[PDB]
Amino acid sequence: VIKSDMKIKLRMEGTVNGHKFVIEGEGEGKPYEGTQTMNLKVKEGAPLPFAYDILTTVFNRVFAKYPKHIPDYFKQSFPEGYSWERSMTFEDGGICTARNDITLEGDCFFNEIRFDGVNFPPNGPVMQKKTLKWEPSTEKMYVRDGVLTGDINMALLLEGGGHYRCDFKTTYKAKKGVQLPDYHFVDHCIEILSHDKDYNNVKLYEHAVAHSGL
Amino acid sequence: VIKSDMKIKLRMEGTVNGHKFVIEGEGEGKPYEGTQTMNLKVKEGAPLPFAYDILTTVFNRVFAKYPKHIPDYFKQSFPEGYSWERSMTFEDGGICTARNDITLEGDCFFNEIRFDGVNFPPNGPVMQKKTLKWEPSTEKMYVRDGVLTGDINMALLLEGGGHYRCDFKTTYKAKKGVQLPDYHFVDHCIEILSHDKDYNNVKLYEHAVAHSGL
Amino acid sequence: VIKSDMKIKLRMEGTVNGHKFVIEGEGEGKPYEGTQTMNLKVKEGAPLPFAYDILTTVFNRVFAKYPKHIPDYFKQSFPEGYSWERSMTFEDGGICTARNDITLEGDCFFNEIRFDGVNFPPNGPVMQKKTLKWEPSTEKMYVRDGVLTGDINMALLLEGGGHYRCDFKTTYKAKKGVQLPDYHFVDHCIEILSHDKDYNNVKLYEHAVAHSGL
Amino acid sequence: VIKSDMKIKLRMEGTVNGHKFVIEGEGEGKPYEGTQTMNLKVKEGAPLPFAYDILTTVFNRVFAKYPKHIPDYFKQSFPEGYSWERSMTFEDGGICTARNDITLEGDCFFNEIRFDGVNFPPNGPVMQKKTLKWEPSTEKMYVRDGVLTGDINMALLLEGGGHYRCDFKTTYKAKKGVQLPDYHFVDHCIEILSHDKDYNNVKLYEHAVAHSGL
């Protein structure tokens, strides 16, 4: 079922700072190379009044290169699939919650996403769209009460330089029992490859690689 | 417009641990006495698989007794009204986001509520419904970048005794400029007066009183 | 042993931002009225390069008015006495740890204090001495694994107005078993009554009152 | 001054849970290979009543392999040297503060260390010595207001399996201006190579490597 080439369909509905929106996406990736590319269209709530970058890491750890010696929680989870929940705690008190329900129909991953952001200061970098990109990162993966937890120290590079910090916690729940991995890492980088004026259209790329550290 | 007796209508839509639900409520309160009572019906997602108590403080600081010497951000905000956003950070990593858009039509407050909870441990008190009540509390109210912020150290009393701690941050945004108060407190207590087996029906009561501390 | 009038002797040794100091104090209070006054002298590390206010709440919950219906963990702890540990988490990442070992010799409380502060931004209000006072507060008191825990949402009023937030957690350990109270509150206010140029000399006052909330 | 082979002398004084101790160490490392080994003796407060592992990462980022393309804040700081401050926020509310003042005399780094830990639950893994090791980690390094900040998601592996999480923030201050690096990573692993019954004697090893991520 998980082939060397898979397609991806997604719908996100969300509210940030009380602003409602819908974004749909279509793309493709190489699960075994840990790469994926997606084309995202704002369907409702254009133009977004917040930094598009807060959304991009919510737009599937199936797209991560897992070595033999590390059990692949994500790939083992299919065909049944899995869901995740995430909190994003920004250093200025902005908080987001997000979830994705991931299903497999043929060679296509369907992603049903909800995103909610609250308490962004009105003159902070998110509401004033001062973000350039996410720096690369390393997710710390560990089992807690029988499900996979990922913690990340994430940072947005700001216009003018310097960084806006965010702590991620993701809980990943396979819909069937799998071989649980030991403590390990997933390196990430995520890049907006192109966008129009108000990010109504966005081409998004991720590379991810699992490893056991030093 | 804000009389000694007002009615309240609400709809909450939410997702906790991936479980979708809708709850509607009707009730009444005394804004100047800082009291209110509400009758809540689960409309979708019965029976709730999580502790109903995580919802109750999301089900309007108009219902708080404000003394003369403290400017009433909430009552001054009408007829135009106000909205709030809240993060609830539980000590075991459970996080909720919530928002309420409050409008005034005649003597009735309409409440449009969204609630989302993530990362509740499956064997924690919320997913195992081990909560008895919220302890009383004191909200710390202060202006930050021109809007009212409230911080609360909240605690749920547990079955077996001892407490489950939650930190609230609420940002309150009047839809028109008002007299901003100085740093002050709002004492709260919130009580489920009655409920059926699975909290399909709930009668809920709050008392709230603003003060300037010692 | 705990009379209506008691004396207080203290020595604090500490390091903030790498700056070492020693402060000694002598004063007096009314345990049953929940009041105390103290005279503090900087003995080493004058002039302090940080906001003196970060120290003042570390300079004994014996000085709190406890009503009959709330068991007094502190007063019950003597003659043997008690110790406490505290973390102070400031909203800009400044963190302090502090401890006090409290003994009773005659009508005098001896206080052996250690205070350590790290990660204060060099252009933040603590290192630029922009604090005016602590706002009043309400400490939430609860038992956790057999010892009394206090949580406080504290705020320093800043020069220019607006607030610098700090979260306190104190663990209070009686040196003998006592009647553990139920969940309750202690209202505080703390005031620098007078000081010289660089706070080499400071007269400090606290009022504290325990209550059961609404 | 920073040769391919350097010696290390250290003294830590600290208090955890009110327990006072002094630990001295002597060792050696390869700054350009990012390796170091140290022999630590408890001089006061034997036997330690807490998990020795909370101390080991406080026992100098000079011992990290820095590639050409990343400015070496640490090595550039000598001969004048640098100091750091650290907060360690454990997931059960245990908090430590630590600092190190690092000087260079000949081929020897001198380390003047203070460590303070508070609010460790009495039946938690630190006070019940249930820790096996620190998992490897990746420190996120970024400049904030002109000094180097490092954030780490750290985890102790527990007896019985599963993990105890700790968030590190270190502020690193060179005693002279240097070439500030861009956002980057330092991979770490730290290992107790050997110890006696109560960790009165400990041989400690670290490997560290700076990189720019994916």
Residue numbers in the entry:
A (entry chain A), B (entry chain A), C (entry chain A), D (entry chain A): 5 to 63, 65 to 219
Sentences from the paper on this structure:
LEA was engineered to represent the evolutionary node that acquired the unique ability to photoconvert from the ancestral green fluorescent protein (ALL-GFP), which was engineered on the basis of ancestral gene reconstruction from the great star coral Montastraea cavernosa.
The ncAA incorporation of an extra methyl group to the chromophore histidine ring greatly reduces the photoconversion efficiency versus LEA and the LEA-A69T mutant, but surprisingly enhances the dynamic photoswitching under 505 nm irradiation which can result in a larger red yield and red:green contrast under dual illumination than traditional 400 nm irradiation of LEA-H62X. LEA-A69T crystallized in space group P212121 with a full tetramer in the asymmetric unit, while LEA-H62X crystallized in I222 with a single protomer per asymmetric unit; both crystal forms were described previously for LEA. However, the local environment surrounding the P-ring of LEA and LEA-H62X are essentially indistinguishable; therefore, the blueshifted absorption of LEA-H62X likely stems from the slightly twisted structure that results in a reduced conjugation between the P- and I-rings, consistent with the blueshift according to the particle-in-a-box principle. Regarding the drastic change to the photoswitching behavior under 505 nm irradiation, the pre-twisted P-ring of LEA-H62X may enable the substantially more efficient on→off photoswitching than LEA. The extra methyl group causes the largest horizontal shift of the imidazole ring in LEA-H62X relative to LEA, with LEA-A69T lying between them.
